[PDB]
Amino acid sequence: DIVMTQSHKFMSTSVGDRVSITCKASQDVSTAVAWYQQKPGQSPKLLIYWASTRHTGVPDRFTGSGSGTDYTLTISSVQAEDLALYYCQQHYSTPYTFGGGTKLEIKRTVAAPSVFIFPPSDEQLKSGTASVVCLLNNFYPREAKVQWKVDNALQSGNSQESVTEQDSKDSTYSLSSTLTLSKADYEKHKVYACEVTHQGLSSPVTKSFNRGEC
C-alpha cells in the first residue's frame, strides 16, 4: 500500500496570501496525483488531476506542482471561501490512497461575539425540561470561555457547547452553549446568566434574564 503523508493537519493563512499544502508519497507515483477540496458539510470537489491539471469550474488561483515523490497544492491569493480541508490522493496503483488531510485555517482581524441568551420556550417547560441557550455570534479567534451562573452560582457539568466552522464570507466562528436543567430545578432560581470570555472583549460580557420577566 502506498502511503500519502500530509505532514500538516493545519495550515494557517491570510486572505490575499499564498499557501502551499505539501503531500509526500512513500514511492514514485509518477504524476498521478489528485487534489480535493472539502468545505464544511460538503463532498470533496476535484481541484487538480495529474499533479498540475485544473478541473472545470475551478479558479486560476489554485495550482498544482510536483514530480516523483513530493507534491504541492498552491493557492495564490487565498480567498475567504477557500476554507476547507485539502486531500491529496495517488491514482498510481490500487489500492488508491489519500493523504490524512490538511485543514486550511484563515486568519482575520479580532472580532468580539455578539452575545444573546434564550430562555426555555413555555412549551418545553411544559414537557419537563428547561433548555437555556446562549449564542455567541460571529467572533474571532476560536478560543472562548462561556460560564453559566444561576443566581450568581457558578455552573459545572450541566452545559454543552458546539462551534461552527469558519464562515465562508467573514472567517468568523459561532458557538451555542445550552444549560440543561429539570423544570423543577429551573423554577427555584431567578437570575440566569451567560458570561462570555473572549480576546476581543475588554472584560467578560454577561447576558442575563430574570425568570419570567422581560
Binding site: S43, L46, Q89, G100, F118, V133, V163, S174, T178
Partner: protein
Amino acid sequence: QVQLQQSGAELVRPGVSVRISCKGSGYTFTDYAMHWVKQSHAKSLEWIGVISTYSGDARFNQKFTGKATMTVDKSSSTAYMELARLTSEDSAIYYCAREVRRSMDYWGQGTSVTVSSASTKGPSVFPLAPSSKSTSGGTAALGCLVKDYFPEPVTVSWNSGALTSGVHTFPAVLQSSGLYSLSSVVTVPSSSLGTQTYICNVNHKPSNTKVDKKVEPKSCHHHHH
C-alpha cells in the same frame, strides 16, 4: 448538469447489510467507472473499490474484500454498493465518485450510515424567541432548538430556503439520553420582527419527521412604569 444522487441516511442493525445507491445524471452513465470511498471519524478518506459501469468488473481494497460488494444497473443509470455483516466501525459517510480518466472528478452528496440497535426517534422542535435580551442594534437573533432525535442527520432551513444569510446551524451534541440535540440560529434586522414571518423547517429523514415552526417573540412580563 452533472450530478450523482445518493440514497439517503440509513439506520441499520449490527450483522445485517446495507445497500447504497448512486444515480449518475447529466452525462452518459456507462462512460465512466464508479468509485466508492469511506469517510469516517472526521477526515480519514478510504478507497473501497471501483466498478466499471460498462463491463460490471469491480476490484477492491483488500481491506474491504468480503465486506464490500458492487453491482451496476445501466438502465436506471445507478451504481450500488453493499456493505455486509455490519459492526459499529462501518458507521461512516460513504461517497460515490465517478472516475473520468484516473481522477475522481465528481462526488455524490454522501450517504450517512449508522449502525445501531436503537429505533429512530424524531426531534422535538422549540422556538428560540427574539426579545430585548436578543437585540444588538438593528439586529435580532432568533432560532430553533431541535431536541431529542436519533440518528443523524437533521436538516434545518429557514422560510423554506429563502432565508440563508446570517444562518448558523450547529453541530449536534449527544445528550445523556443517547439522543442528539442541535440548534439553528439566524440574525435578522429587528425592524422586521412584526412585519416578517420567521419559520424554521426541520427535516429528520430516518424518522420521517418534518416540522415547520413559527418563531414568535415570547410571552414576557414588562417592567411597571
